[PDB]
Amino acid sequence: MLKAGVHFGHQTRYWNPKMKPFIFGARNKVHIINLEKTVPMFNEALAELNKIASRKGKILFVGTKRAASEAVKDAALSCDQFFVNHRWLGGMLTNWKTVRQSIKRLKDLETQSQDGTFDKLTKKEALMRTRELEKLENSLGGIKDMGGLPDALFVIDADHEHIAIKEANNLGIPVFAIVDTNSDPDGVDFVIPGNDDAIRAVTLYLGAVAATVREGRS
Amino acid sequence: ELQEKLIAVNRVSKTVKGGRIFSFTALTVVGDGNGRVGFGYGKAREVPAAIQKAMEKARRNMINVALNNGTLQHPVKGVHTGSRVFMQPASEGTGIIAGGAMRAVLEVAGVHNVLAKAYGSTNPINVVRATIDGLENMNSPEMVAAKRGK
Amino acid sequence: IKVRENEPFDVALRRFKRSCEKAGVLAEVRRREFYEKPTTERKRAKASAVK
RNA sequence: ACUAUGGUUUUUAUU
RNA sequence: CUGCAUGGCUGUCGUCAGCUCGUGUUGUGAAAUGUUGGGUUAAGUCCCGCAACGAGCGCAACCCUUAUCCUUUGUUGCCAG
RNA sequence: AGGCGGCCCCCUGGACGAAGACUGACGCUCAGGUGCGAAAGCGUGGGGAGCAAACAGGAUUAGAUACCCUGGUAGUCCACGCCGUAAACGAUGUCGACUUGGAGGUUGUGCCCUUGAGGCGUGGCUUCCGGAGCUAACGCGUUAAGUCGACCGCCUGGGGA
How does DSSP assign chain A, residue by residue? --S-S----B-SS---GGGTTTEEEEETTEEEE-HHHHHHHHHHHHHHHHHHHHTTPPEEEE--SGGGTTHHHHTTTTSS-EEE-S---S-TTTTHHHHTHHHHHHHHHHHTT--HHHHH-SSSSTTGGGTTHHHHHHHSTTTTTT-S--SEEEES-TTTSHHHHHHHHHHTPPEEEEE-TTS--TT-SEEEE--S-SSS-HHHHTHHHHHHHHHHT-
Tell me how the structure was determined.
Answer: cryo-EM
Resolution of this structure in Å: 17.0
Helix (H) or strand (E) holding B106: none
Q: Which residues contact A185 (CB under 8 A, 6 or more apart)?
A: A18, A19, A22, A158, A177, A179, A191
* Closest-approach nucleotide to residue B16, Cα vs C1': D15
- Residue A13: how many CA atoms within 13 Å on its side-chain side? 0
- Give the SS3 label for residue B84: strand
User: Neighbours of B (≥3 Cβ pairs closer than 8 A)?
Assistant: none
Q: Which positions of strand D lie within 7 Å of protein CB atoms?
A: 15
Question: How many CB atoms are closer than 10 A to CB C51?
Answer: 3
Question: DSSP class of residue C22?
Answer: -
As a whole number of angstroms, the distance between CA A142 and CA A148 comes to 13
Q: Backbone phi, then psi, for A208, in 5-degree steps?
A: -70, -15
User: Neighbours of A (≥3 Cβ pairs closer than 8 A)?
Assistant: none
* Closest-approach nucleotide to residue A20, Cα vs C1': F100
- Residue C15: how many CA atoms within 13 Å on its side-chain side? 3
Question: DSSP class of residue B88?
Answer: E
Strand E surroundings (CB within 7 A): A 87, 89-91, 94-95, 97-98, 101-102, 105, 128, 131-132, 136, 163, 166-167, 170; B 14, 21, 41, 43-45, 49, 53, 56, 60, 125; C 29-30
A23 CA → F107 C1’, Å: 36
Cα–Cα–Cα angle for B18, B20, B23, rounded to 5 degrees: 130
Q: Which residues contact A56 (CB under 8 A, 6 or more apart)?
A: none
Integer CA distances (angstroms), C47 to A120, C18, C50, in order? 65, 16, 7
* Closest-approach nucleotide to residue A16, Cα vs C1': F101
Q: What is the 3-state secondary structure (H, E, C) of B8-73?
A: EEEECCCEECCEECCCEEEEEEEECCCCEEEEEEEEECCHHHHHHHHHHHHHCCEEECCCECCECC
A146 CA → E47 C1’, Å: 33
- Give the SS3 label for residue B125: helix
Strand F surroundings (CB within 7 A): A 17-18; B 81-82; C 49-51
Q: Backbone phi, then psi, for A119, in 5-degree steps?
A: -80, -35
Closest to A92 in 3D by CA, of A144, A176, A160, A167: A167
Beta bridge partners of B26: B9, B42
As a whole number of angstroms, the distance between CA A109 and CA A130 comes to 8
A130 CA → E46 C1’, Å: 16
- Residue A172: how many CA atoms within 13 Å on its side-chain side? 5
* Closest-approach nucleotide to residue B15, Cα vs C1': E30
Burial class (CB within 10 angstroms; exposed 0-12, middle 13-18, buried 19+) of B98: buried
* Closest-approach nucleotide to residue C46, Cα vs C1': F104
Q: How far apart are the first and last CA of chain B?
A: 26
A130 CA → F131 C1’, Å: 46
C43 CA → F5 C1’, Å: 34
As a whole number of angstroms, the distance between CA A119 and CA A101 comes to 27
Burial class (CB within 10 angstroms; exposed 0-12, middle 13-18, buried 19+) of B81: exposed
Backbone torsion region of residue B61, taken as left when φ is above 0, otherwise alpha when ψ lies between -120 and 50, otherwise beta: alpha
Q: Which residues contact A139 (CB under 8 A, 6 or more apart)?
A: A84, A85, A86
